[PDB]
Amino acid sequence: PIVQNLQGQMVHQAISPRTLNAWVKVVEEKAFSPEVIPMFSALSEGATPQDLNTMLNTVGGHQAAMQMLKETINEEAAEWDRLHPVHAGPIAPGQMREPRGSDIAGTTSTLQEQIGWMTHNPPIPVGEIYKRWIILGLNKIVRMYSPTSILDIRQGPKEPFRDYVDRFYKTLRAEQASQEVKNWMTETLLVQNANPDCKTILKALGPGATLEEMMTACQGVGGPGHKARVL
Amino acid sequence: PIVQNLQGQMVHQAISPRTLNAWVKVVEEKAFSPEVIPMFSALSEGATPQDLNTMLNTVGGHQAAMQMLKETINEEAAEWDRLHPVHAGPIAPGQMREPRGSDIAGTTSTLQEQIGWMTHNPPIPVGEIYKRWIILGLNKIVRMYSPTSILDIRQGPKEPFRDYVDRFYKTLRAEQASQEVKNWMTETLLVQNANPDCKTILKALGPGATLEEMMTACQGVGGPGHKARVL
Amino acid sequence: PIVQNLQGQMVHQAISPRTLNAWVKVVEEKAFSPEVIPMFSALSEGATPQDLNTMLNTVGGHQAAMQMLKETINEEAAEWDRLHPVHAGPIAPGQMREPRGSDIAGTTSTLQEQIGWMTHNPPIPVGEIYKRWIILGLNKIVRMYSPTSILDIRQGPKEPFRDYVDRFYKTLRAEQASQEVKNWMTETLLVQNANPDCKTILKALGPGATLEEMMTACQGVGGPGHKARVL
Amino acid sequence: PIVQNLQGQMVHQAISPRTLNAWVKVVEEKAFSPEVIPMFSALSEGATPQDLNTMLNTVGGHQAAMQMLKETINEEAAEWDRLHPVHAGPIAPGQMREPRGSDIAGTTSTLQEQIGWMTHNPPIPVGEIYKRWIILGLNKIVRMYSPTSILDIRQGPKEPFRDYVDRFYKTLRAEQASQEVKNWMTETLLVQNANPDCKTILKALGPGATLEEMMTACQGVGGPGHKARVL
Amino acid sequence: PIVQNLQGQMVHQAISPRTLNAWVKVVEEKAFSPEVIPMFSALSEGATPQDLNTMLNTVGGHQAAMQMLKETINEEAAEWDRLHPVHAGPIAPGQMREPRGSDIAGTTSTLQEQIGWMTHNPPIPVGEIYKRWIILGLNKIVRMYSPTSILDIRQGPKEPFRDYVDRFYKTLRAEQASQEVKNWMTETLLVQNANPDCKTILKALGPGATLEEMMTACQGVGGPGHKARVL
Amino acid sequence: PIVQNLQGQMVHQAISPRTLNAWVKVVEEKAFSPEVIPMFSALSEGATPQDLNTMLNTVGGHQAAMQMLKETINEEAAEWDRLHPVHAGPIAPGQMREPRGSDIAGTTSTLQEQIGWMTHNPPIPVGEIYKRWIILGLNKIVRMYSPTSILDIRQGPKEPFRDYVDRFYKTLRAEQASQEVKNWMTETLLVQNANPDCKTILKALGPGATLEEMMTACQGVGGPGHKARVL
């Protein structure tokens, strides 16, 4: 991708072999996890569509997910092109006739063509646009991996608090829906998806407070609660 | 590879030792996989034929595939020599020589002259055509590797949807077919080779469905397709 | 991150992939160990909010632990809005407008604007205050140590003195108590939970002796307070 | 070795420890293998004689092979100082002294003087000459490697076609003979060493059929072959 | 740590992650080895107190030894405040403010003043003395660690000279006492704790032998089954 | 050590910590191997005495041998102080004072003064001399290690030529003598130390023809003994 700023005009150099092997190893290890989504954003330095396309094409065993990602990139590009078409038709010389929705994608554009519009005129955010579509596609494809929905969490009699809290927050990481609505729901959910003993501990603590105080109380007990009568 | 722009005129630099170690290791771990074909394109940076030639020479286990690759390069070089512009016998003074089919290869050319025809007069696509000829050879190698075929992927009685479509996508890489063909065959084949239970779910959805719509529906249905007409 | 000043005005460099890979591997093997708290402080180079948040966002299974830390940051941001200077809405011309509690976090602040107020006019310590709140969140991570209490330690009869010293130091990493209390407690508690066989030596050495003097004497007693062979 | 053109006049650079350890590992794991011959030329960032002499001296176990190679270099040096343009003793003061055959090597030449004949006046290609002599010694070493004969690569009754091909390519890289002669022999060898059932399909395809054509026929038949024809 | 002079006046750079990961690895591999002490001196380049404290604070297993080292830093700082470069009453403003024993420490010095007095005024060895105090603490740790102390090392009935001398030099690395006494005891101790079979050979060489002379003489004795040949 | 050329005049940097760790790991995995001796020259990125001395000081393993090497250097420095240019003692004001024989070594030398005599006027070759002395000491360590000398090793009765020749060449590396003596000896040695089985083919080869001719003939023999060959 296009790198460096300090020594003058930015230079195009491919991603490091260590970085490429690290990317391949990360998806070999963590394949469908949503924890890989910010990792992809971290390696998107210089955001260059052809290099990003090449990074996308160099994936290992879980390649079916990347074929699904291609459908989203095509759909999103078509949406963007139809949303913005005002510049279409005749435009004066000295300009490079500006990228269309399909020109954003490295698969349908040439390398010299891409670099020019990111630095010879007021920079087009093509890498940023392509990156958000890929991040959006990554958010969409992790839905297929999902083994449990928010109200599908069922807790047995001998399950420990540590497993219950970890299961819920991992399940909640695949939501994407409104944060305010999620907090509001979460407060009711913890008591409802609990087992009798855990439910007794949550009921004992009563309404109010924050996660830290509830965690501090749960920490004092640990494991699968206590067994003696509450009335 | 020949590289440098910002600092001034390009210079032929040495190949990274990490890149050669990575190429040899990638061959040791996964040589026959179609995921390695984009990796070769990615690491073909600065395209010097002599440097590119080292990759074919350094290959271990799959030497027979590399031998076919050398034969393929000669046949494409023969097409370049005889069907593409042959060019005149007389050569003007000062000219850097427009390469013949034998001049492309590092074993029948010398490095300073090889650099010369890519850097003195306007660019000649010697690196790009050599990359393409190697890629054409790589595209044929997966045909000879394939242990199964696209219509030999049949969903068994209790086989889940993800494994079945993973198998279909993995063997699809081996056919080397056009985007038009992939687009028009994908719609019918998944339903056709499906088991009765899975086919019943897919059949119900019918005409007018996109791949994402079908995949989204499959996530809600789950497993090998749940049995018909008993609910 | 933000680097350079004397050798050229500051460049907005991204976090190293090598440090992210180390962070991913350290959390995987060392979990919530006290040793990672100075490592995180060191790795938070330049402390830019959006960039620093990427380390928190790239955490795997431990999403619930991250949620408590994220809640602590929101709690501290709310504390800043309420108990630290309010800041008037009307601001003089040619200003960038000083951060409110929400502005300090990368969620609602714009990266370009955030960089602008951090250094283009006399430095606002936004990264340093944000980093201190994250360290405060890491000071609450010690409450995830199941049944760990220094008052609950007991040295068994066949347990070596070195193992007991190691246990005492390991649980002493979870302190969260004032130095005066620690100084008083250490003298009496260490003798109290020590095994009788080596407790006799601690009693023999008696008051006044320092940690160095106790350790020097305790190397010579061997195993649980007496054992055969020195080789 | 000596490198640098764009930023001035060549400066001496020390060999990389990562590369040196990689050379040691390749020497340990691929010790006498024919695939090391392109690697040595590929990973040598300028064939400076003294630096190349260090590479020969850093061998572990198979010192005997390196001493045979060193003697081969001494023979080549002597032929160069006899059969090639020999430099006569009388000279007019002001030359940097045209090297003698043994001076091509780092053992009778001083490093400052050696770099001097590579930079002071028109360069003498001493590094390339030394590298070619090393390649001649490596050609001797691959004949010492050989623990079988191309005529002794017989495919057994239960041995697969790919194992026969694997063994055949392993011994082929050590065969050192003219390609035109080898290609005529290759037709004979194919039916000479193939097992009855495999030999049956090879005979059916017949001469004038490329390696790809034979692979296509053999791939369909599969394994060590089977009775009659595989349908 | 601090670096740079020719390109511009000193800049305080971040600690290397390779150094920190290496420090964790070395501690895991060989926590108490006396080869760690010069390695720590090599890794401590630039000698910045906060960066030096980062190494102390990241130790896992033998953190108890590091806590004794923390006491040692305070103990030497107390001596330094008392007897070395003492500061009296309030001094005239516009100065570094004549460092006290506490000021040397990372916990009592801010980044601005610690690097400030080093880059504005002529360089002061505050980092160098802090490093020397840490080394003094490391020297205490090896002295405490010692399993066998000086006279303990001896040669058994069947023990080779090779193992006996190896144990003596291992013991001498953790010795931490006067060099003059060490030079003197080296002359007699080796003979005294030797087995009669080897002891007579050592005495037969005559008083006054060097380590080289003793090693050369011991080559004739060597390994297992050392039957004397002195007459 | 002092390094840097293109970015301006020499700067005193430090050896990379990955390389310093690798040096320790080489000592751990290859304690007495002769391969290490040229590696020291290769890794020497600036020959500054203190940095080189630090590498010697980071040795754990074979410390008894290392102390003999260090004392050898100290004694060779003393030899320089009497046989080589000792100098009168006095020196002119406004000069870098010129190093005395002992002070070539790190023990009585300080870094600013040491750098000054390698900067101000044509460098005093203290690094080359110190490096040369270390190589002289390294040669002693392999010589001290030696299990058997050249005339103490013969080919065993069931031993093959390859194993004996490997033992001979490996052994010869540490037997410290002139190149001519080794050459002159080698011609006689093979004939006299051959076993009864292998002597038959070696005597058949006879005088005139060199080792390459003998080794080429012996490749086809079949290992040890002369069993009646089948295939």
Specify the structural class of chain A: mainly alpha
- Give the beta-strand count of chain A: 2
Specify the number of helices of chain A.
Answer: 10
Q: What is the class of the largest domain in chain A in the CATH system?
A: Mainly Alpha
CATH superfamily of the largest domain in chain A: Human Immunodeficiency Virus Type 1 Capsid Protein
Distance between the termini of chain A: 67 Å
Oligomer: part of a larger assembly
Strand order of the biggest β-sheet of chain A: 1-2
How does this structure look, described?
The structure is cut from a larger assembly and holds six copies of chain A (231 residues). Chain A has a two-stranded antiparallel ribbon with strand order 1-2. Chain A contains ten helices and two strands. The termini of chain A are far apart. The relative contact order of chain A is 0.10. The radius of gyration of chain A is 24 Å and the shape is elongated. Chain A has helices at residues 17-30, 36-42, 49-57, 63-83, 111-117, 126-145, 161-172, 179-192, 196-205, 211-221; strands at residues 2-3, 11-12. Chain A has two domains: 1-147, Orthogonal Bundle (Human Immunodeficiency Virus Type 1 Capsid Protein), CATH 1.10.375; 148-221, Retrovirus capsid C-terminal domain (Non-ribosomal Peptide Synthetase Peptidyl Carrier Protein, Chain A, Orthogonal Bundle), CATH 1.10.1200. The interface between C and E is medium-sized, with 27 and 26 residues. The PDB classes it as viral protein. Keywords: magic angle spinning NMR, HIV-1 capsid, CA protein assemblies, HIV-aids, viral protein. Atomic-Resolution Structure of HIV-1 Capsid Tubes by Magic Angle Spinning NMR.
